[PDB]
Amino acid sequence: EECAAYQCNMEGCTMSFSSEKQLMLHKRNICPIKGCGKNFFSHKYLVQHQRVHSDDRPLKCPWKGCKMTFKWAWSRTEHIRVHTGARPYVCAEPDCGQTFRFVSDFSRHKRKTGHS
Numbered sequence: 597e598e599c600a601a602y603q604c605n606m607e608g609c610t611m612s613f614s615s616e617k618q619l620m621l622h623k624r625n626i627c628p629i630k631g632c633g634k635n636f637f638s639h640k641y642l643v644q645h646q647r648v649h650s651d652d653r654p655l656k657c658p659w660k661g662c663k664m665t666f667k668w669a670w671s672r673t674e675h676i677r678v679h680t681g682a683r684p685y686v687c688a689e690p691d692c693g694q695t696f697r698f699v700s701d702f703s704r705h706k707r708k709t710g711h712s
């Protein structure tokens with residue numbers, strides 16, 4: 597529990613450990629995952645790396661029949677548009693008329709072409 601766990605006091609960190617030993621190793625920027633052993637120059641590099649080990653996708657698609665899962669809410673929201681058929685981003689150029697499901701596709705289109 598909280599009482600027994602050892603919390604990290606680095607700014608922005610939300611990690612905790614089963615022992616003071618593993619907290620001390622964590623403060624030396626050693627990966628928390630068994631068998632990895634990678635060390636990092638800063639605490640920011642460590643936290644970013646740990647995410648690569650995780651296959652956790654907590655957010656389930658709400659569309660009945662769909663078994664897809666997502667790490668981030670924005671990714672899930674973008675995905676749901678596949679089911680609804682929504683194309684929110686419409687090109688403003690006069691003879692284009694092109695639509696896009698994701699903003700990154702719309703941004704890529706505006707960069708690739710010279711469109712408003």
Ligand SMILES: [Zn+2]
Pocket residue numbers: 604605606609610611622639
């Ligand atoms: Zn930490």
Ligand SMILES: [Zn+2]
Pocket residue numbers: 627628629632633634645646649
């Ligand atoms: Zn690692």
Ligand SMILES: [Zn+2]
Pocket residue numbers: 657658659662663664675676679
């Ligand atoms: Zn879905």
Ligand SMILES: [Zn+2]
Pocket residue numbers: 687688689692693694705709711712
């Ligand atoms: Zn366009």
